Symmetry: C5
Subunit: 92 residues, 5 copies
C-alpha cells in the first residue's frame, strides 16, 4: 500500500555499498490498533531506507520504485522501499 | 486488472522529484456495489498518478508499465500505476 | 501460465503511445468448462496486446517478457502480455 | 523454488524471435509422489527453455534471471525460466 | 523479509557463468522453533549466493536487489538473493 508506518532504526555502520548514503529505517504495514494504542512489533521483515521525514512515525508514502533511491543514490543499482514523499497530515 | 476505478486527489505540492510532473490520483480496485450505489472507501493503499481523463471516475485502463510514465516523465526512473488509455464507455 | 485463452477486442483508436502499433486483445486464464461448452466471461482484468494468431481463440502461448513487445515495438518501454508464439494444435 | 522438475518437449519450429536459439522445455514444480511413482501431469502452465542437462528429468536448478538467458541469448530481451546450472545428484 | 536464515552449502564447481564468483548458499525463511531448538529442513527452494558473513547461520540481512550482486559481480546480469549486509547481533 502507498501508506505505511515508518519506525526509527540505527546501528553500527554496516550496509551494502549501494545502500550507503541512505539511512536505514524499519517499515511496518500495521499501525495503530483500531485507531487506538500505538502498538508494538518485534518482527522487522519489511525494511525501508530513506531520509528523515515528519509524520514518518505515524504515516508516510512509500514505494519500491528505483526512482526514489535514484535521486538520493542515482546510477541505479539499489532496490528497496523508500520515502518518495511525506504527508502533512498527522495523527492527533 | 486492466480496468480500475480512479478517484480525484489533490494536496499541497509534495511528491518525489521523479514523480513531479504527474498529477497524484487515488486508485481503487473496488467500484460500484452490485452495479448499484457508488460506494465509498477510506483506505488508499493503491495510488496512481496520471493526467485527467474522462470516465476516470467510473472506469479507466491502468498499467504499471514504465512506458506509461515514460511518455510523460521519460528518462525512465519513476515506477507506479498510470492511465495509459481511457475508455469512451461510461456508467449510466 | 504459458497457455492462455485470447479473445478478440476492437474499439475506437485509443491506446498508450508506447502501446501503439500493437492490436489490443483480451486475455482470459479460464477457458472451456470441463472440456465442454466454450463459456463466456464479462470481466476483462487480464489484457493482452499482440498480432493475430491462429488458434488464439482456443489456446496460445503468452508471456510478459518485454522481448515479445520488443520485436514489434522495440526501443523497450511498453510492459504487458503478448503472444510470443502460437501452437498449431487446436480444439476439435 | 530453486529446485524444479524439467520435462522434454519438442514441436514444429515456432517460437518468439528473442526466444530463438533456446530449446523449449516444460517445467513442473511437482515431481515424484511421496518419493514414489514418477507421476504424470497434463497442465503446462510453467514453461522453461534451456539447453539439455543431465538429471533434468529428475531435478535441476532453475531461475528467472535474465542472466541465464543472457549467456545463451545475450543482448537482453527474453524473459523466462532457464537452467542456470545442473546437479550431479540424481534419483535412484 | 529482510531477516533470513542462511545455511552453508558447497558442491562440485557448477554454476551459471553470471553466478560465477559468488559462493552458493542455501537460504531458509524459517529458523529456530519457538526460540528453541535449531531445527532442520530438507527442502531448498530458496537459494541465495553471497560471501561468508558472521552470524549468517543465525540471522542475516538479505535482498534480491541486483545492486547487491552488482558490487561483487557487476555489469548487471545475475538475479537472486544476496547478503547485502550482516548484523552484529547473534543468538545466544
Amino acid at each position: 500500500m502507498k501508506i505505511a508506518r515508518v519506525c526509527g532504526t540505527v546501528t553500527s555502520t554496516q550496509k551494502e555499498d549501494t545502500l550507503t548514503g541512505v539511512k536505514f529505517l524499519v517499515l511496518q504495514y500495521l499501525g495503530e490498533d483500531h485507531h487506538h494504542h500505538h502498538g508494538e512489533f518485534l518482527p522487522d521483515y519489511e525494511v525501508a531506507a530513506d531520509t528523515v521525514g515528519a509524520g514518518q512515525d505515524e504515516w508516510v508514502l512509500v514505494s519500491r520504485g528505483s526512482a526514489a533511491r535514484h535521486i538520493i543514490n542515482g546510477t541505479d543499482k539499489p532496490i528497496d522501499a523508500a520515502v518518495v514523499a511525506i504527508i502533512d497530515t498527522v495523527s492527533r
